[PDB]
Amino acid sequence: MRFQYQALLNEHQSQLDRFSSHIVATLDKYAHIPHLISKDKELVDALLSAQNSAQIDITNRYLEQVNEVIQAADTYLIDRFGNTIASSNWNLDRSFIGRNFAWRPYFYLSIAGQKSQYFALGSTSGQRGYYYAYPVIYAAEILGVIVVKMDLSAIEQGWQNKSSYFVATDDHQVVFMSSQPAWLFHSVADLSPAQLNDIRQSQQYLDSPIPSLGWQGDLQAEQSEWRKPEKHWLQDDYIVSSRPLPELALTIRVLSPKI
Ligand SMILES: [Ca+2]
Ligand SMILES: [Ca+2]
Questions:
Q1: Per its UniProt entry, which superkingdom is the organism in (predicted)?
Q2: Which residue ranges are tagged as binding site for Ca(2+)?
Q3: Ligand 2 centre and the CA of 229: distance in Å?
């Protein structure tokens, strides 16, 4: 079987190439949309007359149309103070209208004039998403931020292997996407109270308890093994190959049971 270990690592490299490709192709359908619509009349006019209900009506219906064309979860416009003033979900139970997101990194970074991206557990929706944001600029001034939130299903559904698993981990090794849903919002390895407090303060996963999956291993290695404490009652160990995707601040990992 060890006569098969290198071959498995080689196959892992191909799986990571194919999945990373799928991820990039899927995100590419949404990444440029905030810039595309950012200066559109409907968005700028709303930011300039945010308390004009007829204008907000026009802008809400436009964002709803855009959101349907791109098949995103939500597309919404935020003023320069962080308040959502128009949104594709204005007519849904999860309406973001009136909610303030100045505390979210995608708003903090984009109101400073740059494009930004982020992933999180949605605070109003309760749904995970990948977020792209872009500043709305008119007459050389930043007036607000436009955001597109993408549901993660098409990415997770692209993992079709039935003999291996994948997880996408953030910088604290918290599992944000996975082919095993039970591992979502758990860390790969134990975290200290201080680390858990930092995650909680960021609100990236809201108030989610972040339990530990308890694996041990070199989480910084491209090719490694994850094991449980010796003599533990379940030794579900794995051969694990990892591929960081810096732009996304996520590392993709493929896990194959060892033996
Ligand atoms: Ca435009
Ligand atoms: Ca084993």
A1: Bacteria
A2: 36, 40, 237, 258
A3: 13
Burial of 141 (0-12, 13-18, 19+ CB in 10 A): exposed
- Of 108, 87, 85, 89, which Cα lies nearest the Cα of 98? 85
Q: How was this structure determined?
A: X-ray
The DSSP secondary structure of 40-73, one letter per residue, reads -HHHHHHHHTTT-HHHHHHHHHHHHHHHHHHT-S
Resolution of this entry, Å: 1.7
How much distance in Å is there from the Cα of 16 to the middle of ligand 1?
A: 35
Give the C-alpha separation, 190 to 197, whole Å: 13
Ligand 2: distance of its center to the CA of 239 in Å? 9
Write down all domains in the chain, each with its CATH number in brackets.
Answer: 2-27+153-258 (3.30.450.20), 28-149 (3.30.450.20)
- 81's enclosing H/E stretch is none
> Distance, CA 37 to ligand 1 centroid (Å)?
4
